[PDB]
Design a protein around this ligand. Structure first.
Ligand SMILES: [Mg+2]
Ligand SMILES: [Mg+2]
Ligand SMILES: [Mg+2]
Ligand SMILES: [Mg+2]
Ligand SMILES: [Mg+2]
Ligand SMILES: [Mg+2]
Ligand SMILES: [Mg+2]
Ligand SMILES: [Mg+2]
Ligand SMILES: [Mg+2]
Ligand SMILES: [Mg+2]
Ligand SMILES: [Mg+2]
Ligand SMILES: [Mg+2]
Ligand SMILES: [Mg+2]
Ligand SMILES: [Mg+2]
Ligand SMILES: [Mg+2]
Ligand SMILES: [Mg+2]
Ligand SMILES: [Mg+2]
Ligand SMILES: [Mg+2]
Ligand SMILES: [Mg+2]
Ligand SMILES: [Mg+2]
Ligand SMILES: [Mg+2]
Ligand SMILES: [Mg+2]
Ligand SMILES: [Mg+2]
Ligand SMILES: [Mg+2]
Ligand SMILES: [Mg+2]
Ligand SMILES: [Mg+2]
Ligand SMILES: [Mg+2]
Ligand SMILES: [Mg+2]
Ligand SMILES: [Mg+2]
Ligand SMILES: [Mg+2]
Ligand SMILES: [Mg+2]
Ligand SMILES: [Mg+2]
Ligand SMILES: [Mg+2]
Ligand SMILES: [Mg+2]
Ligand SMILES: [Mg+2]
Ligand SMILES: [Mg+2]
Ligand SMILES: [Mg+2]
Ligand SMILES: [Mg+2]
Ligand SMILES: [Mg+2]
Ligand SMILES: [Mg+2]
Ligand SMILES: [Mg+2]
Ligand SMILES: [Mg+2]
Ligand SMILES: [Mg+2]
Ligand SMILES: [Mg+2]
Ligand SMILES: [Mg+2]
Ligand SMILES: [Mg+2]
Ligand SMILES: [Mg+2]
Ligand SMILES: [Mg+2]
Ligand SMILES: [Mg+2]
Lengths: 263, 60, 206
RNA sequence: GAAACUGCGAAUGGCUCAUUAAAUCAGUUAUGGUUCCUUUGGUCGCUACUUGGAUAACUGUGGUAAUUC
RNA sequence: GACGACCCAUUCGAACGUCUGCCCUAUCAACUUUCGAUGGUAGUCGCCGUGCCUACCAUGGUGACCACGGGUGACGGGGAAUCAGGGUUCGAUUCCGGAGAGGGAGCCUGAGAAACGGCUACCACAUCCAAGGAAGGCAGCAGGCGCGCAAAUUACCCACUC
RNA sequence: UCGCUACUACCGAUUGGAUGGUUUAGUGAGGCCCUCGGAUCGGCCCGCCGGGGUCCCUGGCGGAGCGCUGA
């Protein structure tokens, strides 16, 4: 039977970009309900023992999190399967280090340490616009936040830079032809380039083009574009190799020349 | 049949037993929460009136 | 129980389908309300996801509106006359949406009088004299034409309507499912609907 | 801090393949035709220095051969 | 800070619906309908769309491009065996979807069930008795009878995944 | 063709037997809904006692319509 919501998640059926093994055991953490979709999230448990190696078994994650050390967007989260996701800024005070969840160019999250004078603001993508009771205009971002009284020029698909202690958006980039963008869905995942186009098929999945810093172009769907810069100048810091998605015939050459077989 | 007499004043009780159905006719063909004088119960109960509060069956 | 499933009945081609599962709960039926007329009797039912739902039996009063004058007043409901779907609901006086009813029409008279300072359907001049004429004619001189001439050129209640008040019963149409909102609201007949239903009532019954 | 009232969960998980041929199922799309425990963010101003009666555990008397009576 | 709470959004879903896709059978050629069959108008009901159901009205809808009836040692798919190229046969079975707890039926509580490690009744079984009454559901894990050519221990532990 | 021995299916008096499913006619447990019903348990209206105040308000005991009202 299914008569209600499920609550376990099998290890094989889990998302691929979690990069889980196969022979530990039958289950996977099953992210809890949150602001980020179940396939797009990264639970806090998978970030501390599969990536940062800080813990070793699930109980060590539970007793790291209980001591109130970890902060997800300023607030102090105690749930180990909390669904962190794209544009969230984990902070570990007791160590003095910070991170930004951004897709690496193979289409998966990777650790990306940032300077503590940067981990005070995060970007959000506008999803909806509506006028509440008494005539107040609202906003909905990709991570479920609701901003009341936003500027009357910010529209859908735009990006806004908020603060983590107030909300209260500060800057906003407008979606049009010429601005930077990072792609967050499908085949082209974690690539960067100027938008350069947008076609519009009314009633079905408008399509968007892009263009890398090496001529490479790659279409996508508009609901997968995420503007991160005014133009050619990304606001937030970037991972190494900057979304350039080199082919395997190049990846082999760099592996051979660097001879990165040790340290 | 036996009886389970109770006194809500001081909080005491006693399980008494009778057999002469003569001293049982005061109850027969009556309902619960009814009150009845215990004058036929014996010499010791004269100005005694008690309320029937239910009980059990044969088989319990 | 009773159910509103699609799968119990046959497809375009005229061929049967064999049963696919036991009746689910989300296909649930429940029986008719059949609102009668009388002193209020509203029950409630718990529906999918909490969400009280008020079933109405034995209603009496309705918040009817008068579109031309923008009036609306809690009014007693007198009777049902015509039912546009099944006729044996007027023989048993069950009160459902888009029924046709007679109401009491008194508060509309009171509003019209006090607002336009004029008389509606009356019989004589004897009853109006002992009282309520102290409202039609006033102390006022300033005001009494400064506004009551703004109420002139406008008091032209239609003939079909004016002929009704002389009995004190108005034709009205329900616009709410009593069995799902507990209330029996609606509007009062104007214009061409009036002629339609006058014809229909005079035609079928009697 | 036993017990007991209260809250929550028990609708996930596990097992099997009898039924069932436009059904189930797959890819594709739509809810502008609906509901949603929980999580996340909004929203929280048209006798009062604090009201009512009544139950369990506990004490005591019990019934039936027998029951989580 | 813990808790509770109205509504809105978000999340995990759920539900209904569109297009295309199926094994064998003509010794199944016409089927469907006041016991709703296709459609219209108004309602009932329901979480919402809807002959979903009632009242009146029309006489329609499907078929040689195989309808409708029958059979399947038929649960569907991701897949498995063999394989020059094309193909043939298998898929109860660890992932996803569905359906069911002896057979049929009805419902309580809840956000969520037509739930059976929940309740009520009939059918078939079966246990206890002081003959008044009471109690039951291994297609969970072990184990036993039966059936058959055909399938393991009535062990240990929450240390790992959750 | 006739005659022998083994095996396979066919027709058929019995109007075979059993099993399962259909189905007109009649009955129909149990739950839900509705219209009733009212076992029983309360509260406010009249005395005596204790508190306040000028007979009333509280708490208790008893009794009269138990009148009304609630579950
Ligand atoms: Mg299950
Ligand atoms: Mg089931
Ligand atoms: Mg979880
Ligand atoms: Mg709700
Ligand atoms: Mg409990
Ligand atoms: Mg619960
Ligand atoms: Mg079935
Ligand atoms: Mg068939
Ligand atoms: Mg068939
Ligand atoms: Mg289809
Ligand atoms: Mg699908
Ligand atoms: Mg489909
Ligand atoms: Mg909870
Ligand atoms: Mg909240
Ligand atoms: Mg219709
Ligand atoms: Mg309709
Ligand atoms: Mg025909
Ligand atoms: Mg034809
Ligand atoms: Mg067929
Ligand atoms: Mg198969
Ligand atoms: Mg089968
Ligand atoms: Mg091959
Ligand atoms: Mg299979
Ligand atoms: Mg089988
Ligand atoms: Mg098996
Ligand atoms: Mg399965
Ligand atoms: Mg599905
Ligand atoms: Mg069995
Ligand atoms: Mg609940
Ligand atoms: Mg059941
Ligand atoms: Mg179960
Ligand atoms: Mg039970
Ligand atoms: Mg039983
Ligand atoms: Mg069992
Ligand atoms: Mg077993
Ligand atoms: Mg054997
Ligand atoms: Mg074997
Ligand atoms: Mg064996
Ligand atoms: Mg464990
Ligand atoms: Mg022979
Ligand atoms: Mg022979
Ligand atoms: Mg034969
Ligand atoms: Mg037979
Ligand atoms: Mg028969
Ligand atoms: Mg019947
Ligand atoms: Mg009955
Ligand atoms: Mg009945
Ligand atoms: Mg009643
Ligand atoms: Mg009553």
């Amino acid at each position: 039977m299914a008569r209600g919501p499920k609550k376990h998640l099998k290890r094989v059926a889990a998302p691929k970009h979690w990069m889980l093994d196969k022979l530990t055991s039958v289950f996977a953490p099953r992210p809890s309900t949150g602001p980020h979709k179940l396939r797009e999230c990264l639970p806090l448990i998978i970030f501390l023992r599969n990536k940062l190696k800080y813990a070793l078994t699930g109980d060590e994650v539970k007793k790291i999190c209980m001591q109130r050390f970890i902060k997800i967007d300023g607030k102090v989260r105690a749930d180990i399967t909390y669904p962190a996701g794209f544009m969230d800024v984990i902070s570990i005070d007791k160590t003095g280090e910070n991170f930004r969840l951004i897709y690496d160019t193979k289409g998966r999250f990777a650790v990306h340490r940032i300077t503590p004078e940067e981990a005070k603001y995060k970007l959000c993508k506008v999803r909806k616009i509506f006028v509440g009771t008494k005539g107040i205009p609202h906003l909905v971002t990709h991570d479920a936040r609701t901003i009341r009284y936003p500027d009357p020029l910010i529209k859908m698909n735009d990006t806004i830079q908020i603060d983590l202690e107030t909300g209260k958006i500060t800057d906003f980039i407008k979606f049009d032809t010429g601005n930077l963008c990072m792609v967050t869905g499908g085949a082209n995942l974690g690539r960067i380039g100027v938008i350069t186009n947008r076609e519009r098929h009314p009633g079905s999945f408008d399509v968007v083009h892009v263009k890398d810093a090496n001529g490479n172009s790659f279409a996508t769907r508009l609901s997968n574009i995420f503007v991160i810069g005014k133009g050619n100048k990304p606001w937030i810091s970037l991972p190494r190799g900057k979304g350039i998605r080199l082919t395997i015939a190049e990846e082999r050459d760099k592996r051979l020349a660097a001879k990165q077989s040790s340290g | 049949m036996k009886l389970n007499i109770s006194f809500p004043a001081t909080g005491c009780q006693k399980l008494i037993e009778v057999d002469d159905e003569r001293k049982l006719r005061t109850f027969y063909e009556k309902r619960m929460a009814t009150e009845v004088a215990a004058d036929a119960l014996g010499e010791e109960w004269k100005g005694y009136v008690v309320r029937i509060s239910g009980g059990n069956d044969k088989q319990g | 129980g009773i159910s509103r499933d699609n799968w119990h009945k046959r497809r375009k081609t005229g061929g049967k389908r064999k049963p696919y599962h036991k009746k689910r709960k989300y296909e649930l039926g429940r029986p008719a309300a059949n609102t009668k007329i009388g002193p209020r009797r509203i029950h409630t039912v718990g529906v999918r996801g909490g969400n009280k739902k008020y079933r109405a039996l034995r209603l009496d009063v309705g918040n009817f509106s008068w579109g031309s004058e923008c009036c609306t007043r809690k009014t007693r409901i007198i009777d049902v006359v015509y039912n546009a779907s099944n006729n044996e609901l007027v023989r048993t006086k069950t009160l459902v949406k888009n029924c046709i009813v007679l109401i009491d029409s008194t508060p509309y008279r009171q509003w019209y009088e006090s607002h336009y300072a004029l008389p509606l359907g009356r019989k004589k001049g004897a009853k109006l004299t002992p009282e309520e004429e102290e409202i039609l004619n006033k102390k006022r001189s300033k005001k009494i034409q400064k506004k009551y001439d703004e109420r002139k050129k406008n008091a032209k209640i239609s003939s079909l309507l004016e002929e009704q008040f002389q009995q004190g019963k108005l034709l009205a149409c329900i616009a709410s499912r009593p069995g799902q909102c507990g209330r029996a609201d609606g509007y009062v007949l104007e214009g061409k609907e009036l002629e339609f239903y006058l014809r229909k009532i005079k035609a079928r019954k009697g």
